[PDB]
Amino acid sequence: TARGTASRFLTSVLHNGLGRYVQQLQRLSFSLSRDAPSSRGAREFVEREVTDFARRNPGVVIYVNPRPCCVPRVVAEYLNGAVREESIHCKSVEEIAALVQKLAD
């Protein structure tokens, strides 16, 4: 509901895209597990295509943490200081790739 939630006007960060386009994704931290069955998609993503994403986007610092966690998470920190925390719990590699690309965009 629009009346129940907040609102804002359309705007760009620091006049992005005017003189040059600066990617707003600053860092991407994956927290996964090396043996939990729910982290299998995250493990396959890290094995296969985290390096390709890092090479495609050199302006974002990617951290990977294998720790004993039950739910795997991804934390996207932007140039504004905004933090977006998403759960990659039980998702396919394609779903992880789509979510990561959406966060980058």
Partner: protein, 140 residues
């Protein structure tokens, strides 16, 4: 094996978060909130459907205002702008009326000229006289 619900707090809060800004006991009591939240959502969908109609009516009113300010009626202005193959919708026309007064006056002058050419052609009933702005340009 006795099973009881343990997440009822979150089940209640998921509904109560959408009614915090209500008035009366509907923002507190769950029984009175579920009915009010459902009505709020139904009204949200209906008003989403009606927002386009409301905004189109507002744009039409603003176009009528500007055209009458230029000494022209809205139906004549629209039909002559269409006859001039100028396919600008009501939103753009209202934007021009508010923020581009000279451009809107030029459009009104063009519409009035096309109306005059149409009236002259209808009065003459002659095929050989063709208006300068009454010519139709096909796709190229």
């Amino acid at each position: 094996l006795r099973s009881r619900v343990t997440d009822r707090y979150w089940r209640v809060q998921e509904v109560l978060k959408h009614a915090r800004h209500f008035r009366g006991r509907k923002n507190r009591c769950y029984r009175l909130a579920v009915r009010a939240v459902t009505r709020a959502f139904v009204k949200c969908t209906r008003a989403r459907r009606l927002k386009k109609r409301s905004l189109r009516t507002l744009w039409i009113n603003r176009i009528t205002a500007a055209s009458q300010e230029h000494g022209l009626k809205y139906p004549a202005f629209i039909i002559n702008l269409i006859k001039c193959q100028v396919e600008l919708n009501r939103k753009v026309l209202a934007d021009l009326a508010i923020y581009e007064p000279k451009t809107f006056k030029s459009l009104a002058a063009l519409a009035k000229r096309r109306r005059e050419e149409g009236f002259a052609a209808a009065l003459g009933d002659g095929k050989e006289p063709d208006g300068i702005f009454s010519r139709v340009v096909q796709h190229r």
